[PDB]
Ligand SMILES: Cc1cc2nc3c(=O)[nH]c(=O)nc-3n(C[C@H](O)[C@H](O)[C@H](O)COP(=O)(O)OP(=O)(O)OC[C@H]3O[C@@H](n4cnc5c(N)ncnc54)[C@H](O)[C@@H]3O)c2cc1C
């Protein structure tokens with residue numbers, strides 16, 4: 001009910017960027033509230049984002065038919081993961097709150113951050129088909145995305161040329177974060193930061209600092225509870241028969257991905273209900 | 274269907290293993306197109322040991338503003354001056370030549386592998402791949418066709434409307450619309466190979482044969498539906514919003530236009546998976 005440890009993952013090469021200023025603003029605001037703040041500035045760490053056989057520090061189980069998921073899980077169980085992955089996994093294990101600070105790039109996370117998820121979020125460590133989504137290993141943790149874009153807010157509105165931002169956010173927030181157990185908080189969306197005058201930029205930094213004063217007390221984003229599904233291969237991980245019947249009486253879909261051919265609830269991936 | 278002899282294909286592969294089904298699919302695609310007279314070029318990102326990280330090392334000469342580095346403006350300027358790193362230039366020349374672009378990858382964390390995401394970031398430079406002046410429909414790759422050939426760990430049912438992962442059409446949207454279509458590409462129906470780890474040996478053989486059979490007449494296919502850019506007022510003053518007349522015509526519709534342009538309505542079935 002009180003958050004004490006935070007991890008800030010930053011994905012920007014420039015110490016001069018607004019992204020770096022947002023990482024500094026976050027670290028300062030949380031430290032003032034008594035949090036222990038740990039950082040993963042991917043570029044300053046020269047983080048290797050590419051999965052490979054070298055992520056296993058020893059012999060492989062089946063090198064003739066190398067399969068990264070089974071091999072990396074085995075290396076995790078045996079303590080044979082590459083020390084750079086182990087150090088990141090320790091940061092995650094200690095954190096209550098995880099902040100991801102990054103510029104939106106090609107409607108997703110920068111490649112360096114994509115590879116950080118790929119090499120760090122190893123099976124059993126971060127996810128398991130035995131405890132999916134709300135039952136996941138990171139269920140006691142909270143995650144938040146703080147994103148800057150080149151495009152304006154209107155471009156990402158329902159009627160905007162790029163389409164709904166809620167759709168762009170879904171694969172990261174549900175698929176990457178929520179699948180691992182994280183309760184996902186409302187994203188900090190900083191639109192067209194390149195076309196924002198100096199006065200407003202100072203205020204964006206202060207607004208983010210003020211939000212972080214009570215971040216742990218916020219209501220997280222709504223995702224469909226895992227209890228609504230038959231979480232086993234035989235049923236095909238499909239929504240329960242009774243839930244399918246009950247949902248026929250629902251006007252809106254449960255979320256973006258669980259729209260069910262119905263209207264998506266307004267800002268399902270942007271605002272808590 | 275119509276002959277494509279001498280036409281050009283680029284296969285971008287994102288898998289390190291020669292023994293992978295992804296590599297098998299790349300080989301099947303190259304053999305099928307070559308049999309139809311296509312000129313086939315590949316970008317095996319792991320074999321190339323492709324640098325996937327955007328940095329100032331992507332520009333060879335002097336920068337416009339080295340104390341305040343901004344990748345978009347610096348990379349565009351480098352493209353205009355022909356000062357992009359040679360590895361980027363070699364990939365941009367492969368794309369320029371290609372009529373058809375196949376992206377062969379295993380689905381990783383509900384998107385493209387980091388190496389392929391890095392390829393998009395370093396290769397798809399402004400002016401070369403996109404402009405705010407000619408977004409989406411009018412984009413530089415409007416004469417080209419792109420196709421995703423994806424393999425997944427999860428079954429088809431996990432990615433169905435009622436599946437635990439949610440609708441696959443939503444996962445596909447940021448790649449197909451945001452990356453490919455924004456650049457002008459006509460996007461073809463994705464080749465989706467679900468739970469390839471659970472597929473029996475005879476079924477895996479027939480997935481390869483089915484892919485080869487599809488590539489025999491791929492250029493003749495109807496592309497996926499995206500809302501035309503002509504429905505929007507493409508400028509800052511209008512905020513790149515749908516035209517008033519389009520908004521009025523949409524009020525009594527039950528269905529939205531696409532995944533991204535769902536407009537608070539019902540998404541048409543398989544908008545990112547099946548063409549109309
Ligand atoms: C590969 C690539 C792909 C992209 N794809 C997309 C896409 O899909 N969608 C999209 O919308 N955009 C896209 N973009 C644009 C991108 O999201 C923006 O360029 C980015 O968000 C800008 O954020 P920044 O941190 O780099 O800011 P900067 O450009 O570095 O900074 C913005 C301003 O803030 C100022 N600033 C810095 N520090 C401070 C401080 N302490 N206090 C106040 N002001 C400060 C700077 O001086 C500058 O004036 C893409 C960019 C790249 C490189």
Ligand SMILES: Cc1cc2nc3c(=O)[nH]c(=O)nc-3n(C[C@H](O)[C@H](O)[C@H](O)COP(=O)(O)OP(=O)(O)OC[C@H]3O[C@@H](n4cnc5c(N)ncnc54)[C@H](O)[C@@H]3O)c2cc1C
Pocket residue numbers: 051065066067068069118119288290292293294295296297378379380381382383384424425426427428469470474477478481
């Ligand atoms: C970091 C990471 C994240 C992931 N995230 C996700 C996710 O978000 N969603 C998801 O659903 N999955 C996810 N996965 C799973 C991933 O999509 C699968 O592991 C992958 O698609 C398997 O395809 P492959 O090419 O590696 O095949 P392999 O596992 O290498 O092989 C599959 C089968 O094909 C056989 N085969 C190979 N060549 C031939 C041939 N010529 N003819 C016939 N059979 C052949 C093999 O022997 C094997 O039986 C993730 C995996 C990783 C590494």
